[PDB]
Amino acid sequence: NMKQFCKISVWLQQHDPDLLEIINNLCMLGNLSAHGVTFIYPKQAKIRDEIKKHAYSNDPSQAIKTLESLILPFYIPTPAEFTGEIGSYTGVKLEVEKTEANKVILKNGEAVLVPAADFKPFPDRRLAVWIMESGSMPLEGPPYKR
Amino acid sequence: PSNMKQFCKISVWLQQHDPDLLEIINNLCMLGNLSAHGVTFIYPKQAKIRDEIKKHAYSNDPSQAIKTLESLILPFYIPTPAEFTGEIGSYTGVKLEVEKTEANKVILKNGEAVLVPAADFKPFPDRRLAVWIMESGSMPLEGPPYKR
Amino acid sequence: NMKQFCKISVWLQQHDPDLLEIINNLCMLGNLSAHGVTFIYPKQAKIRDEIKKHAYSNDPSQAIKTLESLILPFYIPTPAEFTGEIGSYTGVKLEVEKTEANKVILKNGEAVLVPAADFKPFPDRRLAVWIMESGSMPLEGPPYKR
């Protein structure tokens, strides 16, 4: 069990090996590899099992877009960086509803995001992991200029 | 565990059906041959073909297992019996000659390879991947090469 | 078991899966892949004990630097090639104290290196594995210049 992380997959392996297995079996591990990378871990098991349900269905389309909505190609370590033209691999721009010192609430789903207390990246490696305690990440909306 | 119904790469299908064979392909540094010109994989159903792959791989000279696995991987997208035509072949370079064609079966010369499309291999719509089941015979190893 | 190897990782997967997992968890698997590559497996347990301890600590800096000293970006199959401007990923130049037909003893730690009896590379692959029966690989010193 690692305490520092050179890649997000090592963190996800210690928390949810099943979800990491789905990311690999969907050919999406490259989206998790660092432009920075910020992963949104859905804490609620109902969300993750809905991902597993769709991923192991005859059409994993919804599991793909949902996992795309949880992976941002940007390095966002603190609430201060949750600003500007940023978003997930779906392309939908994220809009902040409320900001705090260690918490962020987004619009278009009301997703409450708190930085992972145990995730800490290697020196100068631009990786970040947030915990989605409630709500859902946006799926459709205005795009961010990439 | 992994129970994908659609496949973004052939290794996912192999991991669920034959994980030991996938480990052999990885241990022989041949996973790149399986990845996307489009790729068609021929899965060996019979024991004596698969056992010789395992034995040759874990022997002092794994070259024979490498050549056999090269015969089972075609750098072409061949989903149906109709596509088994023209200058196509495996990584051995040998051109495939069709003996008899059916709606859902192909028999090849130079080994009597009886090939049936794997029904449970359904690739992603944007992936030029195909998996066939060799029910008997052997894929061509040596023969006239196909024009590159 | 494999008798011939296309990459060092397959050999380490058979002899020490724990050490391979550490290398992957430190994002150092690429250091072992081929210019040639020479891996030095520490036979003594406590050297591998300390690698694991520093790896899963709060700061894996030492486990990283230790593994860097065990991986050489050069193809050294026999004692005859243990000469010239050679060294590990730490950059420190290796100086040979004693050379034999099937053994090589280094300065700056008295590392006794014998080629692995069961590692035979693929014909066109420049990979070699040595067993460090005693001593330590150099950590600091004058660098060879690439």
Side-chain angles (χ1 to χ4, degrees), chain A residues 21 24-25, chain B residues 2 7 9-35 41-44 50 53-54 57-58 69 72-73, chain C residues 2 6-7 10 13:
Chain A
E21 187 188 23
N24 271 292
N25 296 154
Chain B
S2 150
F7 301 99
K9 51 191 170 189
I10 297 182
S11 60
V12 175
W13 183 94
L14 200 54
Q15 173 58 37
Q16 300 172 181
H17 289 75
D18 202 336
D20 289 356
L21 182 54
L22 172 61
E23 180 187 8
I24 290 180
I25 295 184
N26 269 290
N27 289 1
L28 287 171
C29 292
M30 295 188 63
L31 189 67
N33 300 302
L34 223 51
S35 305
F41 178 60
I42 310 299
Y43 181 77
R50 204 212 160 240
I53 296 181
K54 184 183 181 189
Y58 298 117
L69 285 164
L72 301 171
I73 308 166
Chain C
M2 284 297 170
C6 70
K7 46 189 171 189
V10 176
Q13 181 193 39

Short mmCIF file of all heavy atoms in Angstrom, two decimals, chain A residues 21 24-25, chain B residues 2 7 9-35 41-44 50 53-54 57-58 69 72-73, chain C residues 2 6-7 10 13:
data_model
loop_
_atom_site.label_atom_id
_atom_site.label_comp_id
_atom_site.label_asym_id
_atom_site.label_seq_id
_atom_site.Cartn_x
_atom_site.Cartn_y
_atom_site.Cartn_z
N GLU A 21 -10.19 -1.92 -13.19
CA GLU A 21 -10.30 -2.98 -14.19
C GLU A 21 -11.23 -2.58 -15.32
O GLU A 21 -11.00 -2.92 -16.48
CB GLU A 21 -10.78 -4.27 -13.52
CG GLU A 21 -10.76 -5.48 -14.43
CD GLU A 21 -11.43 -6.69 -13.80
OE1 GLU A 21 -12.25 -6.50 -12.88
OE2 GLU A 21 -11.12 -7.83 -14.21
N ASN A 24 -9.44 -0.10 -17.62
CA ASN A 24 -8.54 -0.81 -18.53
C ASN A 24 -9.31 -1.54 -19.62
O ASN A 24 -8.98 -1.43 -20.81
CB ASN A 24 -7.67 -1.79 -17.74
CG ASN A 24 -6.38 -1.16 -17.25
OD1 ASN A 24 -5.50 -0.83 -18.04
ND2 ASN A 24 -6.27 -1.00 -15.93
N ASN A 25 -10.36 -2.27 -19.24
CA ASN A 25 -11.15 -3.03 -20.20
C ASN A 25 -11.95 -2.14 -21.14
O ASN A 25 -12.51 -2.65 -22.12
CB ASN A 25 -12.08 -4.00 -19.47
CG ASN A 25 -11.32 -5.04 -18.68
OD1 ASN A 25 -11.82 -5.58 -17.69
ND2 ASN A 25 -10.10 -5.34 -19.11
N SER B 2 -13.76 -9.26 -14.72
CA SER B 2 -14.05 -8.72 -16.05
C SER B 2 -15.00 -9.64 -16.81
O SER B 2 -14.69 -10.82 -17.01
CB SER B 2 -12.75 -8.53 -16.83
OG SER B 2 -12.97 -8.67 -18.22
N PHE B 7 -15.77 -5.32 -26.84
CA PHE B 7 -14.33 -5.38 -26.66
C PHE B 7 -13.65 -4.25 -27.42
O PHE B 7 -13.85 -4.12 -28.63
CB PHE B 7 -13.79 -6.74 -27.10
CG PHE B 7 -14.39 -7.90 -26.37
CD1 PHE B 7 -15.42 -8.64 -26.93
CD2 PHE B 7 -13.96 -8.23 -25.09
CE1 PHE B 7 -15.99 -9.69 -26.25
CE2 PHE B 7 -14.52 -9.29 -24.41
CZ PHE B 7 -15.54 -10.02 -24.98
N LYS B 9 -10.28 -4.08 -27.34
CA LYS B 9 -9.06 -4.71 -27.80
C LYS B 9 -9.21 -6.21 -27.63
O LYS B 9 -9.98 -6.68 -26.78
CB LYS B 9 -7.82 -4.20 -27.05
CG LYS B 9 -7.95 -4.24 -25.54
CD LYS B 9 -6.83 -3.48 -24.85
CE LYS B 9 -7.11 -3.33 -23.36
NZ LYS B 9 -6.13 -2.41 -22.69
N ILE B 10 -8.47 -6.97 -28.44
CA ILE B 10 -8.61 -8.43 -28.43
C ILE B 10 -8.12 -9.02 -27.11
O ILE B 10 -8.62 -10.06 -26.67
CB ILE B 10 -7.87 -9.03 -29.64
CG1 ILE B 10 -8.51 -8.54 -30.94
CG2 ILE B 10 -7.88 -10.55 -29.59
CD1 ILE B 10 -7.89 -9.12 -32.19
N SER B 11 -7.17 -8.36 -26.45
CA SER B 11 -6.63 -8.88 -25.19
C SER B 11 -7.71 -9.00 -24.12
O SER B 11 -7.62 -9.87 -23.25
CB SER B 11 -5.49 -7.99 -24.70
OG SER B 11 -5.93 -6.67 -24.48
N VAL B 12 -8.72 -8.13 -24.16
CA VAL B 12 -9.81 -8.23 -23.19
C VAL B 12 -10.61 -9.51 -23.42
O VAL B 12 -10.98 -10.20 -22.46
CB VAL B 12 -10.71 -6.98 -23.27
CG1 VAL B 12 -11.91 -7.13 -22.34
CG2 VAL B 12 -9.91 -5.74 -22.91
N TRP B 13 -10.88 -9.85 -24.68
CA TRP B 13 -11.55 -11.10 -24.99
C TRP B 13 -10.71 -12.30 -24.56
O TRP B 13 -11.24 -13.26 -23.99
CB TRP B 13 -11.86 -11.17 -26.49
CG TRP B 13 -12.63 -12.38 -26.92
CD1 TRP B 13 -13.98 -12.49 -27.06
CD2 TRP B 13 -12.09 -13.66 -27.29
NE1 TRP B 13 -14.32 -13.75 -27.48
CE2 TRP B 13 -13.17 -14.49 -27.63
CE3 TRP B 13 -10.79 -14.18 -27.36
CZ2 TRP B 13 -13.00 -15.81 -28.03
CZ3 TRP B 13 -10.62 -15.49 -27.76
CH2 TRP B 13 -11.72 -16.29 -28.09
N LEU B 14 -9.41 -12.25 -24.83
CA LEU B 14 -8.53 -13.37 -24.47
C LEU B 14 -8.39 -13.51 -22.96
O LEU B 14 -8.30 -14.63 -22.45
CB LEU B 14 -7.16 -13.18 -25.13
CG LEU B 14 -6.30 -14.43 -25.27
CD1 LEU B 14 -7.05 -15.53 -26.00
CD2 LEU B 14 -5.00 -14.10 -25.99
N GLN B 15 -8.38 -12.39 -22.24
CA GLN B 15 -8.25 -12.44 -20.79
C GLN B 15 -9.42 -13.19 -20.15
O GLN B 15 -9.23 -13.89 -19.15
CB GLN B 15 -8.14 -11.03 -20.22
CG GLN B 15 -8.17 -10.95 -18.70
CD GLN B 15 -7.07 -11.76 -18.04
OE1 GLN B 15 -5.94 -11.81 -18.54
NE2 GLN B 15 -7.38 -12.38 -16.92
N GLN B 16 -10.62 -13.05 -20.71
CA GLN B 16 -11.78 -13.73 -20.15
C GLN B 16 -11.87 -15.19 -20.58
O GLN B 16 -12.34 -16.03 -19.81
CB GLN B 16 -13.06 -12.99 -20.55
CG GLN B 16 -13.11 -11.55 -20.06
CD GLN B 16 -14.30 -10.79 -20.63
OE1 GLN B 16 -14.47 -9.60 -20.35
NE2 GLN B 16 -15.11 -11.47 -21.43
N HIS B 17 -11.41 -15.51 -21.80
CA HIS B 17 -11.54 -16.86 -22.33
C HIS B 17 -10.32 -17.72 -22.03
O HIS B 17 -10.46 -18.87 -21.60
CB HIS B 17 -11.78 -16.80 -23.84
CG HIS B 17 -13.14 -16.29 -24.22
ND1 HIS B 17 -13.48 -14.96 -24.13
CD2 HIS B 17 -14.24 -16.94 -24.68
CE1 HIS B 17 -14.74 -14.80 -24.53
NE2 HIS B 17 -15.22 -15.99 -24.87
N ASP B 18 -9.12 -17.19 -22.26
CA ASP B 18 -7.88 -17.95 -22.08
C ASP B 18 -6.82 -17.02 -21.51
O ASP B 18 -5.99 -16.47 -22.24
CB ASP B 18 -7.41 -18.56 -23.40
CG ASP B 18 -6.48 -19.74 -23.21
OD1 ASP B 18 -5.83 -19.82 -22.15
OD2 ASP B 18 -6.40 -20.59 -24.12
N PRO B 19 -6.82 -16.82 -20.19
CA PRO B 19 -5.83 -15.90 -19.59
C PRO B 19 -4.41 -16.42 -19.67
O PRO B 19 -3.48 -15.61 -19.77
CB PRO B 19 -6.30 -15.76 -18.14
CG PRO B 19 -7.66 -16.42 -18.07
CD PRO B 19 -7.69 -17.42 -19.17
N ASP B 20 -4.21 -17.74 -19.63
CA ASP B 20 -2.86 -18.28 -19.74
C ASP B 20 -2.27 -18.01 -21.12
O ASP B 20 -1.08 -17.70 -21.23
CB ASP B 20 -2.88 -19.79 -19.46
CG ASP B 20 -3.14 -20.10 -18.00
OD1 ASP B 20 -3.24 -19.16 -17.19
OD2 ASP B 20 -3.25 -21.30 -17.66
N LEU B 21 -3.08 -18.12 -22.17
CA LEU B 21 -2.59 -17.83 -23.51
C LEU B 21 -2.22 -16.36 -23.66
O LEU B 21 -1.23 -16.03 -24.33
CB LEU B 21 -3.64 -18.23 -24.55
CG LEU B 21 -3.26 -18.04 -26.02
CD1 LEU B 21 -1.94 -18.74 -26.33
CD2 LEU B 21 -4.36 -18.55 -26.93
N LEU B 22 -3.00 -15.46 -23.06
CA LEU B 22 -2.66 -14.05 -23.09
C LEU B 22 -1.36 -13.78 -22.35
O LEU B 22 -0.55 -12.96 -22.79
CB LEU B 22 -3.80 -13.22 -22.50
CG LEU B 22 -3.52 -11.73 -22.28
CD1 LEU B 22 -3.21 -11.04 -23.60
CD2 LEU B 22 -4.69 -11.05 -21.58
N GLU B 23 -1.15 -14.46 -21.22
CA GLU B 23 0.11 -14.33 -20.50
C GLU B 23 1.28 -14.79 -21.36
O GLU B 23 2.37 -14.20 -21.33
CB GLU B 23 0.06 -15.12 -19.20
CG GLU B 23 1.34 -15.04 -18.37
CD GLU B 23 1.32 -15.97 -17.17
OE1 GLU B 23 0.38 -16.79 -17.07
OE2 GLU B 23 2.24 -15.88 -16.34
N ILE B 24 1.08 -15.86 -22.14
CA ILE B 24 2.13 -16.33 -23.05
C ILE B 24 2.44 -15.27 -24.10
O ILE B 24 3.60 -15.01 -24.42
CB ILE B 24 1.71 -17.66 -23.70
CG1 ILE B 24 1.72 -18.79 -22.67
CG2 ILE B 24 2.62 -18.00 -24.87
CD1 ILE B 24 1.31 -20.13 -23.23
N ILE B 25 1.40 -14.63 -24.64
CA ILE B 25 1.60 -13.59 -25.65
C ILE B 25 2.34 -12.40 -25.05
O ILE B 25 3.21 -11.80 -25.69
CB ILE B 25 0.25 -13.19 -26.27
CG1 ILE B 25 -0.35 -14.37 -27.03
CG2 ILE B 25 0.42 -11.99 -27.19
CD1 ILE B 25 -1.64 -14.04 -27.75
N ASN B 26 2.00 -12.03 -23.81
CA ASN B 26 2.70 -10.93 -23.15
C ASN B 26 4.13 -11.32 -22.80
O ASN B 26 5.05 -10.51 -22.97
CB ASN B 26 1.94 -10.50 -21.90
CG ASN B 26 0.93 -9.40 -22.18
OD1 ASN B 26 1.30 -8.27 -22.47
ND2 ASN B 26 -0.35 -9.74 -22.09
N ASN B 27 4.33 -12.54 -22.32
CA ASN B 27 5.67 -13.00 -21.96
C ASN B 27 6.58 -13.16 -23.17
O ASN B 27 7.80 -13.21 -23.01
CB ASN B 27 5.59 -14.32 -21.19
CG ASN B 27 5.02 -14.15 -19.80
OD1 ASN B 27 4.66 -13.05 -19.39
ND2 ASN B 27 4.93 -15.26 -19.07
N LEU B 28 6.01 -13.24 -24.37
CA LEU B 28 6.79 -13.30 -25.60
C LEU B 28 6.87 -11.96 -26.31
O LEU B 28 7.33 -11.90 -27.45
CB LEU B 28 6.20 -14.36 -26.54
CG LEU B 28 6.43 -15.82 -26.13
CD1 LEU B 28 5.62 -16.75 -27.01
CD2 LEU B 28 7.91 -16.16 -26.20
N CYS B 29 6.43 -10.88 -25.65
CA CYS B 29 6.47 -9.53 -26.21
C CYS B 29 5.75 -9.45 -27.55
O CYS B 29 6.23 -8.83 -28.50
CB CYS B 29 7.91 -9.02 -26.34
SG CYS B 29 8.74 -8.74 -24.76
N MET B 30 4.58 -10.08 -27.63
CA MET B 30 3.77 -10.08 -28.84
C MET B 30 2.42 -9.40 -28.66
O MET B 30 1.56 -9.51 -29.53
CB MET B 30 3.56 -11.52 -29.34
CG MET B 30 4.84 -12.21 -29.79
SD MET B 30 4.54 -13.80 -30.57
CE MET B 30 3.59 -13.30 -32.00
N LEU B 31 2.22 -8.69 -27.54
CA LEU B 31 0.97 -7.98 -27.33
C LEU B 31 0.76 -6.88 -28.38
O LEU B 31 -0.38 -6.55 -28.71
CB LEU B 31 0.92 -7.39 -25.92
CG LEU B 31 -0.42 -6.79 -25.49
CD1 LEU B 31 -1.47 -7.88 -25.34
CD2 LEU B 31 -0.27 -6.01 -24.19
N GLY B 32 1.86 -6.32 -28.90
CA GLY B 32 1.74 -5.31 -29.94
C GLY B 32 1.14 -5.85 -31.23
O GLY B 32 0.43 -5.13 -31.93
N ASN B 33 1.43 -7.11 -31.56
CA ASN B 33 0.85 -7.71 -32.75
C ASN B 33 -0.67 -7.81 -32.64
O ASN B 33 -1.37 -7.81 -33.66
CB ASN B 33 1.44 -9.10 -32.99
CG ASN B 33 2.94 -9.06 -33.20
OD1 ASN B 33 3.44 -8.40 -34.11
ND2 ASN B 33 3.68 -9.77 -32.36
N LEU B 34 -1.19 -7.89 -31.42
CA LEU B 34 -2.62 -8.01 -31.18
C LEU B 34 -3.35 -6.67 -31.25
O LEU B 34 -4.59 -6.66 -31.30
CB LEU B 34 -2.87 -8.65 -29.81
CG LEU B 34 -3.96 -9.71 -29.71
CD1 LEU B 34 -3.78 -10.78 -30.77
CD2 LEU B 34 -3.96 -10.33 -28.32
N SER B 35 -2.63 -5.55 -31.27
CA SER B 35 -3.23 -4.23 -31.19
C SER B 35 -3.25 -3.55 -32.55
O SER B 35 -2.40 -3.81 -33.41
CB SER B 35 -2.47 -3.36 -30.18
OG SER B 35 -2.40 -3.99 -28.91
N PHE B 41 -7.56 -12.25 -34.99
CA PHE B 41 -6.94 -13.27 -34.15
C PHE B 41 -7.62 -14.61 -34.37
O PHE B 41 -8.85 -14.70 -34.44
CB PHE B 41 -7.01 -12.88 -32.67
CG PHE B 41 -6.42 -13.91 -31.75
CD1 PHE B 41 -5.09 -14.29 -31.86
CD2 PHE B 41 -7.20 -14.50 -30.77
CE1 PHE B 41 -4.55 -15.23 -31.02
CE2 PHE B 41 -6.67 -15.45 -29.92
CZ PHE B 41 -5.34 -15.82 -30.04
N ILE B 42 -6.81 -15.67 -34.46
CA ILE B 42 -7.29 -17.03 -34.64
C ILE B 42 -7.03 -17.78 -33.34
O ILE B 42 -5.88 -18.07 -32.99
CB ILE B 42 -6.61 -17.73 -35.83
CG1 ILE B 42 -6.67 -16.84 -37.07
CG2 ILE B 42 -7.25 -19.08 -36.09
CD1 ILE B 42 -8.08 -16.53 -37.54
N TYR B 43 -8.11 -18.11 -32.61
CA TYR B 43 -7.96 -18.79 -31.33
C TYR B 43 -7.89 -20.30 -31.55
O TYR B 43 -8.80 -20.87 -32.17
CB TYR B 43 -9.11 -18.46 -30.40
CG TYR B 43 -8.98 -19.12 -29.04
CD1 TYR B 43 -8.10 -18.63 -28.09
CD2 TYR B 43 -9.73 -20.24 -28.73
CE1 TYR B 43 -7.98 -19.23 -26.86
CE2 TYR B 43 -9.61 -20.86 -27.50
CZ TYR B 43 -8.73 -20.35 -26.56
OH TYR B 43 -8.61 -20.95 -25.34
N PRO B 44 -6.85 -20.97 -31.05
CA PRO B 44 -6.74 -22.43 -31.24
C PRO B 44 -7.60 -23.18 -30.23
O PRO B 44 -7.36 -23.11 -29.02
CB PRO B 44 -5.24 -22.69 -31.02
CG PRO B 44 -4.81 -21.61 -30.08
CD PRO B 44 -5.68 -20.40 -30.38
N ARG B 50 -2.78 -25.94 -28.75
CA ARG B 50 -2.57 -25.04 -27.62
C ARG B 50 -1.49 -25.57 -26.68
O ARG B 50 -0.71 -24.78 -26.13
CB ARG B 50 -3.88 -24.83 -26.86
CG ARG B 50 -3.94 -23.54 -26.07
CD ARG B 50 -4.77 -23.70 -24.81
NE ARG B 50 -4.47 -22.66 -23.83
CZ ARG B 50 -4.00 -22.90 -22.60
NH1 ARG B 50 -3.79 -24.14 -22.20
NH2 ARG B 50 -3.76 -21.89 -21.78
N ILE B 53 1.97 -24.81 -28.00
CA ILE B 53 2.31 -23.40 -27.78
C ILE B 53 2.84 -23.21 -26.37
O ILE B 53 3.87 -22.55 -26.16
CB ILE B 53 1.08 -22.51 -28.04
CG1 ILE B 53 0.64 -22.59 -29.50
CG2 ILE B 53 1.38 -21.07 -27.66
CD1 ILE B 53 -0.54 -21.71 -29.83
N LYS B 54 2.16 -23.79 -25.38
CA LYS B 54 2.60 -23.67 -24.00
C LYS B 54 3.96 -24.33 -23.79
O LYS B 54 4.85 -23.75 -23.17
CB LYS B 54 1.55 -24.28 -23.07
CG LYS B 54 1.85 -24.13 -21.59
CD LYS B 54 0.79 -24.83 -20.75
CE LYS B 54 1.07 -24.66 -19.26
NZ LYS B 54 0.17 -25.51 -18.44
N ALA B 57 6.76 -22.41 -25.56
CA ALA B 57 7.00 -21.12 -24.93
C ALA B 57 7.86 -21.28 -23.68
O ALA B 57 8.81 -20.51 -23.46
CB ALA B 57 5.67 -20.45 -24.58
N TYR B 58 7.56 -22.27 -22.85
CA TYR B 58 8.28 -22.50 -21.60
C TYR B 58 9.46 -23.44 -21.77
O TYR B 58 9.90 -24.06 -20.79
CB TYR B 58 7.32 -23.03 -20.53
CG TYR B 58 6.20 -22.07 -20.19
CD1 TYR B 58 4.88 -22.40 -20.43
CD2 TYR B 58 6.48 -20.82 -19.63
CE1 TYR B 58 3.85 -21.53 -20.12
CE2 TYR B 58 5.46 -19.94 -19.32
CZ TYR B 58 4.15 -20.30 -19.57
OH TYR B 58 3.13 -19.42 -19.26
N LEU B 69 2.32 -18.46 -32.89
CA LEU B 69 1.47 -17.32 -32.55
C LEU B 69 1.44 -16.28 -33.66
O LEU B 69 0.43 -15.60 -33.84
CB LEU B 69 1.94 -16.69 -31.24
CG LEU B 69 1.59 -17.48 -29.97
CD1 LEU B 69 2.42 -16.99 -28.79
CD2 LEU B 69 0.11 -17.38 -29.67
N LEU B 72 -1.26 -17.13 -36.05
CA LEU B 72 -2.62 -16.96 -35.55
C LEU B 72 -3.06 -15.50 -35.51
O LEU B 72 -4.20 -15.23 -35.14
CB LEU B 72 -2.75 -17.57 -34.15
CG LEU B 72 -2.43 -19.06 -34.03
CD1 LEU B 72 -2.38 -19.48 -32.57
CD2 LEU B 72 -3.45 -19.89 -34.79
N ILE B 73 -2.19 -14.57 -35.88
CA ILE B 73 -2.49 -13.14 -35.82
C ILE B 73 -2.32 -12.56 -37.21
O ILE B 73 -1.20 -12.56 -37.76
CB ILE B 73 -1.60 -12.41 -34.80
CG1 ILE B 73 -1.66 -13.12 -33.45
CG2 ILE B 73 -2.03 -10.96 -34.66
CD1 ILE B 73 -0.58 -12.68 -32.49
N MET C 2 9.56 -19.50 -17.83
CA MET C 2 10.25 -19.10 -19.04
C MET C 2 11.74 -19.40 -18.92
O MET C 2 12.35 -19.18 -17.87
CB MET C 2 10.04 -17.62 -19.32
CG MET C 2 8.67 -17.27 -19.87
SD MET C 2 8.38 -18.02 -21.48
CE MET C 2 6.63 -17.68 -21.71
N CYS C 6 12.15 -12.05 -23.38
CA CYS C 6 12.12 -10.88 -24.25
C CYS C 6 12.20 -9.57 -23.48
O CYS C 6 12.47 -8.53 -24.08
CB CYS C 6 10.85 -10.89 -25.10
SG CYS C 6 9.33 -10.59 -24.17
N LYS C 7 11.95 -9.60 -22.17
CA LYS C 7 12.09 -8.43 -21.31
C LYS C 7 12.43 -8.90 -19.91
O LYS C 7 12.06 -10.00 -19.49
CB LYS C 7 10.82 -7.57 -21.31
CG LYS C 7 9.53 -8.36 -21.14
CD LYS C 7 8.31 -7.48 -21.36
CE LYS C 7 7.04 -8.31 -21.40
NZ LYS C 7 5.86 -7.49 -21.83
N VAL C 10 9.66 -10.15 -17.22
CA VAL C 10 9.17 -11.52 -17.18
C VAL C 10 10.03 -12.36 -16.23
O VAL C 10 9.51 -13.20 -15.49
CB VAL C 10 9.13 -12.12 -18.59
CG1 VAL C 10 8.71 -13.58 -18.54
CG2 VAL C 10 8.18 -11.33 -19.48
N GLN C 13 9.13 -11.34 -12.76
CA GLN C 13 7.81 -11.85 -12.40
C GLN C 13 7.90 -13.26 -11.83
O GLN C 13 7.07 -13.65 -11.00
CB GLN C 13 6.89 -11.82 -13.62
CG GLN C 13 5.47 -12.31 -13.35
CD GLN C 13 4.69 -12.56 -14.62
OE1 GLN C 13 5.22 -13.06 -15.61
NE2 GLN C 13 3.41 -12.20 -14.60
#
